[PDB]
Structures are given as structure tokens and as C-alpha cells.
């Protein structure tokens, strides 16, 4: 690893600087190096890991969607033949995106998940595992598509089971997990009714528990509840 010679604390420090400079590829490489030191991650460090890779893969997904739309238009009736370039370049972006997803999944498997015993860390990592399988599923078209979708589903389901037992309904990790699993149901699993039911039940159970929270926790929880509400408005 190219980060093997850098101190863990220096990698963390540089990940924070990279975030401030909006250098998310660097941020992700620093956080990968920090994970590979072999120690468990703190709450703040887990957030840095997730932010870094979400920004990297988010740019790749946006580019893939632009190219996929151009390619789909090229395959309409009446569209001129322009050669293999659109497919080739969409495939290039797709392969890079898959590589980033495989990198994140590899960090989770070696060995973040197995070492995560507290609910807050274990749910966080299992949510990430579901997310990166979901991003693989967004671009999958072959014979492994069903297994990729089931891998996302299985990780989300394990995270949900733990989150319901071990964390209050307003916990931001629990809420973000439920948000992303609902998106999985709607966008990946062809299950819009399950997506709607999960978003509604999650929102309502969080609403009923807001009275227990401080002002700052209330702000954290209601921010994610608004995302659930936004999706419910889009979907209904």
C-alpha cells in the first residue's frame, strides 16, 4: 500500500485537509490507508471513510448516468451509427466505478465488519456494504445481477435487524440506513410499495420518539426525516 509508510494519525489529518480542499479521491486514499493500519475506526473516522467514498462514487455514478443516457439514445430508431466510442467510454467509467465499489467492499470484508461489535459501528458498516452492492446493482446487466441485488438486500436486512433491536428510532445511523434501504426497494428491487411502507413507518416511529431528544439531536434526526418525507412526496 502506498500509504503504508504514513502514520495513522497523519492519514486521518490529511483526510480532513483533503475534505476541506474538496479532494475526495485523495481523501478516500488516505482513509483506505488508515483502515489498512488494522485498528478499528472511531465514529468520526467512520464518517470520514463514508464521506470520502460517497463523493468519489457519486461523481462516477453521475457520469455513468450521463453516458448511459447518450448510449440509450444512440440505440433508438433513426439514430445514426457513431461507432463503438460511446459504449467504450461508458464501459470505462463503469469499470472504474465497479473498482471503487470492490475496494470499499474489500475494506469492509478485510476486516472492518468482523471487528465491529458495537451496534453503531456494525450497523454503519453493514449499511455501507448494502450501499456499495446497490451501486454495483445500478450498473449490473449480466448473470450475476440477481446475486448482486441479493447481496445488497442481505446486508441491509442484517443492519436493519440490529438497528431495530439496539438503537432508538431517531438514531441518525438507523434513519439513514432505513432511507437507503427504501431507495434500494424503489430503485433496485422493483418494490415501490415496500419502499413507501418502510419510509412511512420509519418516519412515524422517529416522530414519536423526538420528544426524548435534546435540541441538537432533534435537529440531526429531523434532517434525515425530511429526506424520507421528500421521497414519500416523490413516490406518492
Amino acid at each position: 500500500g502506498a500509504m503504508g509508510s504514513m502514520e495513522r494519525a497523519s492519514l486521518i489529518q490529511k483526510a480532513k485537509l483533503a475534505e476541506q480542499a474538496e479532494r475526495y479521491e485523495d481523501m478516500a486514499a488516505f482513509m483506505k490507508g488508515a483502515v489498512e493500519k488494522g485498528e478499528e475506526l472511531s465514529n468520526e473516522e467512520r464518517n470520514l471513510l463514508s464521506v470520502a467514498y460517497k463523493n468519489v462514487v457519486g461523481g462516477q455514478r453521475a457520469a455513468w448516468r450521463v453516458l448511459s443516457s447518450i448510449e440509450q439514445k444512440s440505440n433508438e430508431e433513426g439514430s445514426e451509427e457513431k461507432g463503438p466510442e460511446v459504449r467504450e467510454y461508458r464501459e470505462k467509467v463503469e469499470t472504474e466505478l465497479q473498482g471503487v465499489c470492490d475496494t470499499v467492499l474489500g475494506l469492509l470484508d478485510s476486516h472492518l465488519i468482523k471487528e465491529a461489535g458495537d451496534a453503531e459501528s456494525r450497523v454503519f458498516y453493514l449499511k455501507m456494504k448494502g450501499d456499495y452492492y446497490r451501486y454495483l446493482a445500478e450498473v449490473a446487466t449480466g448473470d450475476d445481477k440477481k446475486r448482486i441485488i441479493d447481496s445488497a438486500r442481505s446486508a441491509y436486512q442484517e443492519a436493519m435487524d440490529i438497528s431495530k433491536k439496539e438503537m432508538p428510532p431517531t438514531n441518525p445511523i438507523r434513519l439513514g440506513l432505513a432511507l437507503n434501504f427504501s431507495v434500494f426497494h424503489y430503485e433496485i428491487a422493483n418494490s415501490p410499495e415496500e419502499a413507501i411502507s418502510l419510509a412511512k413507518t420509519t418516519f412515524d416511529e422517529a416522530m414519536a420518539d423526538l420528544h426524548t431528544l435534546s435540541e441538537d439531536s432533534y435537529k440531526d434526526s429531523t434532517l434525515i426525516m425530511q429526506l424520507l418525507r421528500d421521497n414519500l412526496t416523490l413516490w406518492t
Partner: peptide, 7 residues
């Protein structure tokens, strides 16, 4: 595109 957990 539905909103997922970001930003």
C-alpha cells in the same frame, strides 16, 4: 432519482 443518505 430518490434522495439517499448524503451530505
Amino acid at each position: 432519482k430518490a434522495k439517499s443518505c448524503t451530505v
